[PDB]
Amino acid sequence: EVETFAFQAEIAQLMSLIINTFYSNKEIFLRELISNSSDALDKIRYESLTDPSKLDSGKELHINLIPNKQDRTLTIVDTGIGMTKADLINNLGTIAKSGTKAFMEALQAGADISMIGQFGVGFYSAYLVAEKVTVITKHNDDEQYAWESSAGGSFTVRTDTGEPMGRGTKVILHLKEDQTEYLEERRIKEIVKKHSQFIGYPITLFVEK
Numbered sequence: 070e071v072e073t074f075a076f077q078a079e080i081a082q083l084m085s086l087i088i089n090t091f092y093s094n095k096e097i098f099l100r101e102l103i104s105n106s107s108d109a110l111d112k113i114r115y116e117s118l119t120d121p122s123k124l125d126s127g128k129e130l131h132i133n134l135i136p137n138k139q140d141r142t143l144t145i146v147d148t149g150i151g152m153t154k155a156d157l158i159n160n161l162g163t164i165a166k167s168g169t170k171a172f173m174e175a176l177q178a179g180a181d182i183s184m185i186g187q188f189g190v191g192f193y194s195a196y197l198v199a200e201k202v203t204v205i206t207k208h209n210d211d212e213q214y215a216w217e218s219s220a221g222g223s224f225t226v227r228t229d230t231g232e233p234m235g236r237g238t239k240v241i242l243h244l245k246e247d248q249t250e251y252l253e254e255r256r257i258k259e260i261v262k263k264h265s266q267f268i269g270y271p272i273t274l275f276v277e278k
C-alpha cells in the first residue's frame with residue numbers, strides 16, 4: 070500500500086534549484102543532515118527530562134554514518150525523536166514553504182546554497198549528491214514509515230516492512246554516479262571534522278568489508 074503525493078509547488082521549486090544550479094561545494098549536505106539529526110536528538114532528550122519513559126524505545130542518543138559501496142548509498146542514522154506519518158507528509162517536520170521563501174530572498178541578496186540550513190530546509194540539500202532519498206522513521210506516537218523521492222515533483226509514503234528501528238530516523242542517500250567520493254572513509258572523516266566537530270552526540274563512521 071503505497072501513497073503518492075505531490076510536493077507543494079514551492080518545495081518542488083527548491084528541489085529543482087538544488088539539483089540544477091551549478092554549485093561545487095556539495096559537501097555541506099552532510100553537515101546539514103547531521104545538524105538535523107542533532108536537533109532531533111535534542112528534542113527527545115528534552116522530552117525525556119520530564120518523562121523518562123520516552124526513552125523506553127532506546128536510551129542511546131547517537132548518530133551513525135554508514136557507507137555502502139555495493140549499493141552506492143550513504144545512510145545517516147540517528148536515535149532522535151523521529152517523525153510521525155503526518156510530519157513526514159508535511160515536509161518532514163519543516164516549515165518548508167516559508168523557509169524556501171526566506172531562502173530564495175536571501176539568495177538574491179547575496180547568500181549561497183551553503184546557507185540553506187539557516188532557513189529550516191537543510192534536509193533538501195541531500196539532493197546535491199543523491200538521485201533518490203529514502204527516509205525511514207519511527208516516532209514514539211506512530212508506526213514505522215518510509216518516505217521516498219527521486220524529486221520530479223512527487224514523493225511516496227508507505228508503512229515500512231524493513232528492520233524495526235525502535236525510535237529515530239534513517240536517511241538513505243542513493244548517490245549520483247559522480248558523487249561516490251562521499252562513500253570514502255577519508256572523505257567522510259574530513260567533512261565531519263571540518264563542519265561537525267562540535268556536535269554534542271557521538272558520530273560513528275562505519276567501515277566496510
Ligand SMILES: OCc1ccccc1Oc1ccccc1
Nearest residue numbers: 105106108109149151161192238
Ligand atoms: O532526524 C533528522 C531528520 C531526518 C529527516 C528529516 C528531518 C530531520 O530533522 C528532524 C526530524 C525530526 C525532528 C527534528 C528534526
